[PDB]
């Protein structure tokens, strides 16, 4: 709010006032010039359409985690918006804001507590954001068409930072394009988007082999064993701040639809994960079967798994499936 | 130690023994739960007046309790000619806290059996101010078939035979 308009439906004199801080008070009805000063006063109330309203949105900052000293943890800060720089920030924006400074009063429990604490914010002025199909880009599409070299130069293109293994770097690039399997028309929802799993225990830090592909491939979200486990792989309802609680906070698969689900640490949190892998290999049952709702959303994402062996090396002279614990998920 | 409510403290709530100063428990043969609690009752007699300090205060209450028990051998009473360590599943030290192992036995006896058998069937035959008094004399005579000093007075002198 920036302006006000009270109408009393007797005189029609709309009393204006400046907007102060976040708490204010309406005035009386015997203050005007025409509808006042008699034995009858028009009783005031508000108006919506005659009251111009502005934009407002709140955000919090942290530190770059490279200029932090060796000691303490970084802390937050409060920022505001005005004018029309709104709807132009995002969670995860490595940005900077330029703006002006002012503190604010607290106006609540100011005697016993809240002596002369200040809890300032900064007020924004400018954002200088950073690090962001036949439309002036066709010159590089011709560079693959003229040079050709699909099966080998593109194989050396993705992940050239290993020793050997051109077979497996070729097995993945076909899955990074996918495509609609068949426009079925009738109610025959066919399987698409095959999933390849890996196994073995090299010492070449297998994690940054696969996950380096994921951080350059499109919409392919990283995950691990800790955190978004197989119960929090889908969406759920959780605690929120004092604003609208019981929102549908998600994990990975409700947001990484039709992309890459690059998983590691397959022996971790398997009581929820072993359900979680079948429910996406099964077509279209990513749901929240909780006591809140029984709504079901889509499932269209490929899976790239890397199971770690048992203790020491996987004994090749011994039997396989001594270290993966899911026979029914694998051989069929 | 029952836990606290919101503005409360970790207090101390007794169970069986600290109530029963002069009473009765039972340990026969809870075979699975034998190793759980037997390390808590054979230190009630040995380290007599036992209490403990889990996650709280280090105190020691007083409990001069009495134990009786009704243990049960694995099958029959003479499961062996072999001795008592072969018969019961208990070991020695917890067994050694007691005073006497009263044991029962009968194989075959004609006259002893009727001395139970004739005895037990007569018990099943034992199934207004004057009338409130007259029912009492009926209640007094029915215990007095041989008059073995009935329970109207017998328990009453026990309580000051102990105090």
């Amino acid at each position: 709010v920036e302006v006000i308009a009270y109408t009393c439906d007797q005189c029609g004199y709309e009393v204006f006032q400046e907007v102060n801080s976040r708490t204010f008070t309406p005035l009386s009805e015997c203050t005007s010039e025409e509808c006042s000063q008699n034995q009858t006063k028009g009783q005031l109330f508000m108006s919506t359409r005659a009251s111009k309203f502005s934009a407002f949105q709140e955000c919090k900052i942290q530190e770059l985690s490279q200029q932090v000293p060796v000691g303490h943890i970084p802390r937050s800060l409060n920022i505001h918006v005005n004018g029309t720089l709104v709807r132009s920030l995002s969670p995860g924006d490595i940005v900077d804001v330029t703006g002006i400074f002012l503190p604010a009063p607290y106006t609540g429990f100011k005697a016993l507590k809240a002596g002369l604490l200040t809890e300032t914010y900064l007020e924004a002025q400018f954002v200088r954001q950073h690090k962001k199909l036949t439309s002036d880009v066709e010159e590089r599409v011709m560079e693959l068409i003229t040079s050709g070299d699909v099966y080998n130069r593109l194989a050396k293109s993705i992940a050239p930072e290993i020793y050997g293994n051109l077979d497996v770097k070729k097995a993945l690039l076909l899955l990074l394009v996918g495509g609609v399997d068949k426009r079925v028309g009738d109610g025959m929802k066919i399987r698409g988007d095959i999933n390849v799993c890996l196994m073995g225990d090299p010492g070449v830090a297998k994690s940054q082999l696969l996950k380096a592909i994921c951080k350059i491939s499109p919409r392919g979200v990283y995950t691990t064993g800790k955190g978004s486990s197989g119960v929090g792989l889908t969406a759920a309802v959780m605690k929120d701040p004092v604003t609208d609680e019981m929102i549908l906070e998600g994990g990975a698969l409700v947001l990484a639809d039709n992309g890459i689900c690059c998983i590691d640490e397959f022996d971790k949190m398997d009581e929820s994960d072993r359900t979680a892998i079948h429910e996406v290999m099964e077509q279209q049952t990513i749901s929240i079967s909780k006591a809140g709702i029984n709504t079901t959303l889509n499932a269209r994402t490929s899976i790239l798994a890397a199971a770690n062996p048992l203790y020491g090396r996987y004994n090749p002279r011994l039997s396989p499936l001594d270290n993966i614990n899911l026979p029914a998920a694998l051989l069929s | 130690v029952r836990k606290d409510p919101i503005t409360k403290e970790w207090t101390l709530e007794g169970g069986a023994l600290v109530l029963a100063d002069k009473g009765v428990c039972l340990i026969d043969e809870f075979d699975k739960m034998n190793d759980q609690d037997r390390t808590s009752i054979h230190e009630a007699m040995e380290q007599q007046s036992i209490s403990i300090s889990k996650a709280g205060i280090v105190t020691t209450l007083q409990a001069r309790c009495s134990i009786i028990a009704a243990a049960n051998p694995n099958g029959g009473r003479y499961n062996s000619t072999l001795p008592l360590a072969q018969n019961v599943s208990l070991t020695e030290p917890i067994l050694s806290r007691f005073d006497i192992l009263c044991v029962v036995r009968d194989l075959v006896d004609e006259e002893a059996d009727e001395r139970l058998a004739t005895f037990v069937v007569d018990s099943h035959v034992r199934s207004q101010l004057n009338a409130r008094q007259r029912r009492l004399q009926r209640q007094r005579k029915k215990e007095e078939e041989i008059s073995p000093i009935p329970q109207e007075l017998l328990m009453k002198y026990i309580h000051y035979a102990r105090t």
Binding site: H72, P103, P105, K110, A111, G115, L116, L117 | -
Partner: protein
């Protein structure tokens, strides 16, 4: 309660408006001065306190000149004035078993 020495009559106020005139008061914040405020609790050096107790603690209010100097886990050595504040016994009525004399150190 920051001048460290003189118990002046406090001003139970955040910001005044309308001085003795008909002018809407404006405030220049570039020429308004600020200062910071940080409390920290100090344990006992747990080798020279003899074995009859857990470590105790008190607290200290310092100022801007030596903030962010105190990483948690430093053998620190401070020196300041000893100081009580707060009303004990009158600010509430009947005041039974409530200390109203907080130990503070406004130091350097």
């Amino acid at each position: 309660a920051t001048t460290t020495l003189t118990t002046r009559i406090p001003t139970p106020a955040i910001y005044p408006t309308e001085d003795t005139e008909g002018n809407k008061l404006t405030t220049e914040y570039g020429y308004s001065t600020f200062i910071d405020h940080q409390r920290i609790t100090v344990q006992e050096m747990p080798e020279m306190a003899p074995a009859g107790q857990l470590p105790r603690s008190i607290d200290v209010i310092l100022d801007d000149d030596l903030v962010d100097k105190t990483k948690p886990g430093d053998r620190v050595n401070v020196v300041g004035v000893f100081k009580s504040l707060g009303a004990g016994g009158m600010n509430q009525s009947n005041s039974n078993t409530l200390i109203g004399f907080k130990t503070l150190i406004l130091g350097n």
